Amino acid sequence: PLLVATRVIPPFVLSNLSGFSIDLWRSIATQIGIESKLIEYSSVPELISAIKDNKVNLGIAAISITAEREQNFDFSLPIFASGLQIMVRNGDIRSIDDLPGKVVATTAGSTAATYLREHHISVLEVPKIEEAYKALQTKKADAVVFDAPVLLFYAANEGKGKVEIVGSILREESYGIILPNNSPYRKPINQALLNLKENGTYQSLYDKWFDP
């Protein structure tokens, strides 16, 4: 059976195991005709090490496809469109223009953390995005920078009436299923994914988590 590394980050991955990426991988696994075990990891870099250490066959959650990651690993066709975005409390912070000199929360080992560090912005790195939302509400942080879809999902729910997404996408990124190089499952994964997109399953799955 295929060993699949995952990471908790709603609405793509939730535990109690559910979410967009979970339903998607399952539809993909069945599409191919193989069984798989989901192994949770605390962060993206940990999930990546699992790939590099050959502990799992692939990884899926809300993994950004980046040049640096593509350099040492491989990816399937994109499974979702994302991008970095700023979120503030419900001001003096309206865009990236205002970030220098502020404290911004985000998850450790994320493309957001890397982007913030490159811009020399003071960062409060937390293990789970949920803790960043708390830092913002408690005012420990002045803003949050993370993947647009995740922030929007939050604003649409728990964050309702308590936050605001400001500015434009600071960095366009798409999600993908990460794999080791020369993986024999990349093509069957892409193949299945394309089928799901061509038969209407991807759409149904999309609406379930992003279209009420």
Rounding to the nearest 10 degrees, give the CA dihedral for residues 60, 61, 67, 69.
-60
If one asks whether residue 57 binds ligand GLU (CB under 6 A), the answer comes out as no
- Pick one of 21, 36, 76, 110: the residue that binds ligand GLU (CB under 6 A): 110
Out of 16, 33, 53, 71, point to the residue binding a copy of itself (CB under 8 A).
71
What the block records as the tokens of 163 is 């936050």
Q: Is 18 in the site for a copy of itself (CB under 8 A)?
A: no
Q: From the list ligand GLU, a copy of itself, none, which binds 137 (C-beta under 5 to 8 Å, kind-based)?
A: none
Task: Using the minimum distance from each CB to a copy of itself, give the nearer residue, 18 or 191.
Answer: 191
Query: Which one of 85-93, 107-115, 154-162, 187-195 is the stretch in contact with ligand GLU (CB under 6 A)?
Result: 107-115
Is the separation of the CB atoms in 175 and 14 below 8 Å?
no
Task: For residue 89, give every residue at least 6 positions away whose Cβ sits within 8 Å of its Cβ, in sequence order, or none.
Answer: 136, 137, 139, 162, 163, 164
151 in contact with ligand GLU (CB under 6 A) = no
32, 91, 178, 180, 208 from 28: Cα distances, Å: 6, 44, 14, 18, 16
Q: CB-based burial of residue 52 (10 Å sphere; 0-12 exposed, 13-18 middle, 19+ buried)? A: exposed
Q: Which stretch binds a copy of itself (CB under 8 A): 12-20, 33-41, 64-72, 150-158?
A: 64-72
- Residue 29 binds a copy of itself (CB under 8 A): no
In the list ligand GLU, a copy of itself, none, the entry touching 7 (Cβ below 5 to 8 angstroms by class) is: ligand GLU
3-state helix, strand, coil in the chain (%, to 5): 40, 30, 35
24 belongs to the binding site for ligand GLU (CB under 6 A): no
Q: Pick from 7, 24, 104, 176 the residue near ligand GLU by CB under 6 A.
A: 7
Q: How many residues bind a copy of itself (CB under 8 A)?
A: 38
- For ligand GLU, the closer of residues 142 and 147 by Cβ is 147
Determine, following the binding rule CB under 8 A, whether residue 194 of this chain makes contact with a copy of itself: yes
How far apart CA 66 and CA 54 sit, in angstroms, is 20
Radius of gyration for the chain, computed over Cα atoms and rounded to the nearest angstrom: 17
